[PDB]
RNA sequence: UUUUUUUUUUUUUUUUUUUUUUUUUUUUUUUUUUUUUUUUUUUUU
């Protein structure tokens, strides 16, 4: 805020913009109010009520999500293992010693305080084995709206078609509309998470197969650390050295933004990847929403950098393109060129020594390794204009790109560097 | 929630005036019907006048029409009502009502609070 | 004005244009007139006669917008939010402590002072859920002559059948023509953006899903500040230093003219965004028609700067299409070899040192900063005239550019510079 | 004399009023004006000029 | 014998409309038409 005035009359003028607060929710925030997570349920009917309840109702258009929790909740309550090391997350100690973990010690368990429904018979425990593994399945069948990629339908079909020869759909075609809704209930996405974050731990379990559909759960909302992982691995480079190629502001503040010291982000098995069905947190602090020039930056380095999955990310709304693509360029061109290959094992202890009697200048070359310190200072003597061997190196990298979607970096990468 | 106050009320001589008040309580910042009833002795409670939110339409029983007049004032959040050329057939404790909305029914059961209601006796 | 002569015969001409006034109404002089807006609605009919009124209307094409706003009333009258601070807007304190506020105590209601209309029965309190969010969806939904952008009603469809799944579109074909009158009634515009007014400072209401519809109410006629948003949030520099580098008088008097100090424009939650349909104005200070020029360049300027929303900006008549495009072009080449890439994080203490013993005199460069005072010297060192670099770049920007709507800006920037 | 700038004035309407039959502001009785600001107009990135006649 | 604008008049002369608008923009979301159970030549002895 500073001031600004109109020279052809000394009058003053105030540039502002209308304002979103639009918060950041972080995880452990929620834990220091509540040290605990309820998951609202109806213990009054009984199990062989609630398979023909959600049978019938799953074979006509009308059902109950609270007749699926409560069904999901017996169906799923008898499940079990054993820790072979504790386990707490959060202030949060749901395991104690050697003794048995189920799927529900993660939550504590309130009742709801119903719906009318209808029942069936001639249901018996073999459709317990693989109903939950059916409603969990529609979770992540019903958050895509595309038409093909719906049609993991057919996967979740296949894998209970494993646990039952004779498995077809008891959804009627407008069923791509009922599962829809079953993302809006709180409890609904309590019982997912409580599932992946169950099956995570114990990994060969019999019914891991569960973890199926909700899998969707985990890091949802959470692309930009996951662009952070990806960046960190197509570069080979470290945490704190990819953290140094940071060269635009705004990545530096949503690059502070992910890394809170107390999140358990680096914990293998915590509550933090599920802090959006659990209910921890309303709006992510790792989404590519709120985190956009990272996921940006990051993506189209990585694509440079011969990635796969940069292919189809989807380019964001409202940043600097031109900067971030330029840092996005300096670093892919840094990374490309100094492959820094190194010599690893020997024979007869005979190692490359290198030649240190070169001295004819060879000056004005790019540095030999991957330190921000030398590239910045090189890219100056570039006069910060990108060299036209940086653009043919990234046109060589976006050529021959084909099959590319609208609206994504890689279409963005092609049409900027392929002419 | 809503509280009334009714203020006004007395004994007055037969062909007397008067003007009854009601002043309201709690949220007066939101949509309210205000009517105006009585209940004579051994009599059901009937209506008397309402009068919209705005303060433009307003409706009177057949028994009061030309005498009796209704209005309010939302910034002071009252409703004044006035009771000329009085009967001892309008002897009976009157009622200021309210019910949330944008216009006065001519019934009971459209109102949903009530004050304690002012005797008038003439 | 300044004398004009013939000068075969001294003749005096006095060269005169038709005037059209096309005033300017800013909100806030709306509330020194009056300190409440009215809401005129009739409270005389039921909500459960009102329910079979409009159901029985929707599905022929008769209806009475009298009827959908008495029943929008009633069927929104029970709905609240607690305040975690105080709300005041234009002197009008419309929250007070930790009292809950309605969706109605926004505005005063008034009585309308008759439609015969026609009832129905067996129409519960089930539909009383989704019927306001439909009557809501319908204002958006016919505000667009577009045919296939008019298909939003499949997506007030299918949030209605989110809510109840056996929901379809009560209205006929022929009702692409019911609803579009609906925008001409000021109590209904006056109810719209009391809700998307309200569910903005509620955001996580359970029925926040009614903004869906409502909430092209927003900024409704206020474009040229959005661009301004665009801009700023494009360029990456500040509210300030955009102002800077406004080139052109015309741009300078509509960025005056929306900057006013006293209209609640930088407020995250104030009356300002819904001037126009709560009728606080009639014409709008911040729309593209009275600022087309700034519309033109900021959206111009955006789209070299990569941005995908500009690719389909309007572009506005009668304006000095030459001095903004070149003011555009100026801009949009600065910040564009200007990326100002600056180390943020450091390992061992160590920054980036920049080289002073530069002294080989690297003049005739363009300068290293995006300061507008060095620019325009620098321009001026280019005879005012557009340099083939700042030409080719702006090619560079606008080429590989498909699908471009006519009209539009980005089919102007692509016929100008791709050639 | 013809109020041609006054905001709301008898001038715009002189042909239907029956104020004049043969208007002085049109494009028959000022060709080379027409073509000559319209043309330039184009030049200078026009679009209602590309239809102007 | 003609006549030699497949010119034509009466004004006129954006296949211009001003009522306000104007990304065939809505983002509550959330965005590899990724997903984990190993696996990972539409390899075989």
């Known amino acids: 805020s500073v001031t600004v005035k109109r020279i052809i009359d000394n009058t003053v003028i105030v540039p502002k913009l209308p304002a979103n607060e639009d918060p950041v929710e972080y995880p452990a925030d929620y834990f220091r109010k509540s040290k605990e997570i309820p998951l609202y349920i109806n213990t009054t009917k009984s199990l062989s009520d609630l398979r023909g309840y959600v049978y019938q109702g799953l074979k006509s258009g009308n059902v109950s999500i609270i007749h699926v929790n409560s069904y999901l909740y017996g169906a799923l309550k008898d499940i079990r293992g054993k820790l072979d090391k504790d386990w707490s997350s959060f202030g949060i100690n749901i395991g104690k010693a050697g003794d048995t973990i189920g799927i529900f010690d993660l939550v504590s368990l309130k009742a709801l305080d119903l719906p009318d429904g209808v029942s069936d018979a001639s249901r018996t425990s073999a459709d317990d084995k693989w109903l939950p593994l059916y409603l969990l399945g529609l979770y992540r069948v019903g958050r895509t709206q595309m038409p093909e990629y719906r049609k993991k339908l057919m996967d979740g079909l296949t894998n209970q078609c494993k646990m039952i020869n004779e498995q077809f759909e008891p959804l009627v075609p407008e069923g791509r509309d009922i599962f829809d809704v079953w993302g809006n209930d709180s409890n609904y996405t309590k019982i997912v998470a409580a599932v992946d974050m169950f099956f995570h731990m114990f990994k060969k379990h019999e019914c891991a197969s569960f973890r199926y559909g909700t899998i969707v759960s985990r890091f949802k909302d959470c692309a930009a650390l996951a662009t952070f992982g990806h960046l960190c691995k197509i570069t080979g480079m470290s945490t704190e050295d990819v953290t140094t190629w940071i060269l635009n502001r705004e990545v530096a503040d949503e690059m502070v933004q992910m890394m809170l010291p107390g999140q358990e982000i680096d914990k293998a098995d915590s509550y933090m990847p599920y802090l959006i069905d659990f209910g921890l947190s309303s709006k992510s602090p790792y989404s590519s929403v709120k985190n956009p020039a990272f996921h940006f930056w990051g993506q189209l380095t990585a694509l440079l950098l011969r990635s796969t999955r940069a292919r189809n990310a989807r380019q964001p709304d409202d940043i600097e393109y031109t900067s971030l693509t330029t840092a996005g360029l300096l670093y892919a061109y840094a990374v490309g060129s100094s492959a820094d290959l190194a010599q690893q094992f020997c024979v007869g202890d005979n190692k490359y020594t290198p030649d240190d009697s070169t001295g004819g200048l060879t000056t004005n070359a790019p540095p030999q390794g991957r330190d921000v310190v030398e590239w910045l200072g090189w890219f100056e003597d570039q006069n910060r204009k990108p060299t036209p061997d940086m653009m043919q190196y990234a046109k060589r990298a976006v050529m021959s790109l084909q099959g590319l979607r609208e609206k994504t970096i890689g279409k963005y990468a092609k049409s900027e560097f392929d002419k | 929630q809503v509280q009334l106050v009714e203020s006004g009320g007395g004994l007055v001589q037969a062909g007397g005036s008067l003007t009854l008040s009601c002043v309201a309580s709690?949220?007066?910042?939101?949509?309210?019907?205000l009517g105006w009833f009585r209940q004579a002795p051994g009599k059901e409670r009937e209506f008397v006048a309402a009068i919209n939110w705005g303060g433009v339409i307003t409706n009177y029983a057949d028994s009061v029409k030309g005498r009796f007049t209704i209005s309010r004032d939302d910034a002071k959040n009252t409703v004044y009502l006035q009771m000329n050329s009085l009967k001892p057939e309008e002897t009976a404790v009157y009622y200021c009502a309210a019910f949330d909305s944008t216009g006065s029914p001519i019934v009971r059961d459209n109102y949903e609070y009530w004050g304690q209601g002012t005797q008038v006796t003439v | 004005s300044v004398t004009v002569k013939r000068i075969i015969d001294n003749t005096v001409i006095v060269p005169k244009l038709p005037a059209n006034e096309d005033p300017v109404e800013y909100p806030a002089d709306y509330f020194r007139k009056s300190k409440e807006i009215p809401l005129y609605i009739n409270t005389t009919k039921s909500l459960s006669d009102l329910r079979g009124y409009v159901y029985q209307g929707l599905k022929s094409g008769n209806v009475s917008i009298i009827h959908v706003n008495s029943y929008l009333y009633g069927a929104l009258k029970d709905i609240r939010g607690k305040l975690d601070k105080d709300w005041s807007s234009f002197g009008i304190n419309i929250g007070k402590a930790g009292d809950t506020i309605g969706i109605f105590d926004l505005v005063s209601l008034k009585a309308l002072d008759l439609p015969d209309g026609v009832s129905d029965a067996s129409r519960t309190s089930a539909d009383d859920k989704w019927l306001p969010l439909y009557l809501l969806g319908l204002y958006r939904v016919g505000r667009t002559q577009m045919p296939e952008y008019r298909k939003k009603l499949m997506d007030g469809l299918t949030n209605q059948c989110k809510m109840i799944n056996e929901q379809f579109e009560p209205l006929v074909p022929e009702g692409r023509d019911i609803f579009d009158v609906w925008g001409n009634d000021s109590n209904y515009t006056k109810i719209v953006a009391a809700v998307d007014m309200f569910f903005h400072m509620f955001k996580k209401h359970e029925c926040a899903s009614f903004r869906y519809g409502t909430i092209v109410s927003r900024f409704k006629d206020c474009a040229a500040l959005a661009t301004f948003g665009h801009l700023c949030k494009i360029t990456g520099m500040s509210t300030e230093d955009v102002t800077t580098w406004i080139l052109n008088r015309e741009v300078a008097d509509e960025m005056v003219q929306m900057m006013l100090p006293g209209q609640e424009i930088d407020k995250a939650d104030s009356y300002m965004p819904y001037l126009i349909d709560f009728g606080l104005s009639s014409k709008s200070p911040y729309s593209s028609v009275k600022n087309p020029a700034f519309h033109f360049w900021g959206q111009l300027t955006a789209l070299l700067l990569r941005s995908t929303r500009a690719r389909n900006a309007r572009q506005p008549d009668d304006i000095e299409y030459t001095s903004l495009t070149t003011a555009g072009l100026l801009y949009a080449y600065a910040v564009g070899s200007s990326a100002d890439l600056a180390q943020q994080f450091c390992v061992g203490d160590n920054k980036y040192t920049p080289d002073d013993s530069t002294g080989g005199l690297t003049t005739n460069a363009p300068p290293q900063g995006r300061d507008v005072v060095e620019w325009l010297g620098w321009f001026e060192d280019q005879n005012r005239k557009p340099t083939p670099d700042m030409m080719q770049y702006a090619k560079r920007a606008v080429m590989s550019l498909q699908g471009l709507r006519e009209k539009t800006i980005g089919k102007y920037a692509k016929s100008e510079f791709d050639k | 004399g013809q109020e041609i700038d006054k905001a709301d004035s008898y001038m715009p309407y002189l042909i239907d009023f029956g104020l004049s039959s043969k208007s002085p502001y049109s494009s028959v009785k000022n060709p080379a004006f027409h073509f000559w600001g319209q043309l330039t107009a184009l030049l200078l990135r026009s679009t209602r000029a590309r239809n102007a006649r």
């Open positions: 709690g949220r007066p910042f939101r949509n309210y019907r």
